[PDB]
Amino acid sequence: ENFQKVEKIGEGGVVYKARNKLTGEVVALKKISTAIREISLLKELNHPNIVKLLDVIHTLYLVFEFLHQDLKKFMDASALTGIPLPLIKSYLFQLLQGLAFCHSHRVLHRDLKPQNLLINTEGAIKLADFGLVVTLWYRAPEILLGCKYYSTAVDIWSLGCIFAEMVTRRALFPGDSEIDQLFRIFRTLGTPDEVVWPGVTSMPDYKPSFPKWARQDFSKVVPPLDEDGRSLLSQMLHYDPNKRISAKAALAHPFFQDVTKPVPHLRL
Numbered sequence: 279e280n281f282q283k284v285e286k287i288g289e290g291g292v293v294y295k296a297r298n299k300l301t302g303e304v305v306a307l308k309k310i311s312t313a314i315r316e317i318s319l320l321k322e323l324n325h326p327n328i329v330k331l332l333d334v335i336h337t338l339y340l341v342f343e344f345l346h347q348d349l350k351k352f353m354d355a356s357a358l359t360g361i362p363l364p365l366i367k368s369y370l371f372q373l374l375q376g377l378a379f380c381h382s383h384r385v386l387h388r389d390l391k392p393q394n395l396l397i398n399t400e401g402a403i404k405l406a407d408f409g410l411v412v413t414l415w416y417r418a419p420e421i422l423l424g425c426k427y428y429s430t431a432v433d434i435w436s437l438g439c440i441f442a443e444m445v446t447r448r449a450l451f452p453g454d455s456e457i458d459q460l461f462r463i464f465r466t467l468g469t470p471d472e473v474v475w476p477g478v479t480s481m482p483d484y485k486p487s488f489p490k491w492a493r494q495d496f497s498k499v500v501p502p503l504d505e506d507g508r509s510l511l512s513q514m515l516h517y518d519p520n521k522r523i524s525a526k527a528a529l530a531h532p533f534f535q536d537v538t539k540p541v542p543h544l545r546l
């Protein structure tokens with residue numbers, strides 16, 4: 279009750295912009311036992327590219343650091359011109375730092391998407407809305423194929439899909455059902471098989487009857503991204519999650535040799 283609601287930000291339960299009546303601080307207020315203990319360990323997961331969880335109030339409200347804009351809105355605003363490459367690269371690099379950190383602490387996001395990447399005036403981008411109409415566009419193929427015990431690699435896939443979208447100004451795999459998501463992936467990357475993804479034919483939802491599409495060449499997928507970027511993107515979208523690049527290894531990729539921190543032009 280220590281909080282006056284200002285504005286509904288979104289329905290992920292519901293998220294409000296709110297003011298704390300004892301601190302003055304403006305926050306994002308998410309109104310939602312084993313879980314109370316999990317969630318409470320997440321208040322300790324602190325990094326400059328993760329949105330801070332300030333407080334967990336069970337009387338379940340989660341009180342987050344407030345950021346004014348998300349990458350989805352910023353991409354819609356940048357649509358006539360495109361986000362400049364040095365800013366794409368800066369955002370990619372920052373998200374990979376955030377992920378490497380989460381992943382080193384065995385925390386997976388599980389549901390990365392432009393809507394939950396938050397940006398500020400200083401050029402920072404932050405991971406929000408961690409997962410403990412549903413959009414499937416960023417889901418890794420092992421999740422779509424019914425794997426119950428998936429890994430940190432699911433987040434690298436999501437982020438590769440976002441990287442592609444920043445570059446092209448179009449969603450990479452805009453599926454509207456699980457099967458359409460999967461076939462859209464297959465149409466671009468090729469239907470996977472045991473040669474490229476050992477064990478694939480044993481995933482819970484794999485069907486031998488899936489149609490067999492041939493792989494497209496990547497130069498068609500994210501023009502006009504340079505070879506460094508396309509190389510990193512291909513490694514993030516590797517089918518086999520054991521071969522997909524880690525966040526740590528991606529930070530050493532040649533694509534980042536000239537990374538900088540530009541500031542974006544934001545209308546709040």
Ligand SMILES: O=c1cc(CN2CCOCC2)c2ccc(O)cc2o1
Nearest residue numbers: 288290306342343344345394406407
């Ligand atoms: O957990 C959250 C989720 C949101 C917004 N969601 C993202 C997904 O879509 C619904 C809207 C959020 C917004 C601003 C903020 O500062 C912190 C935040 O923390």
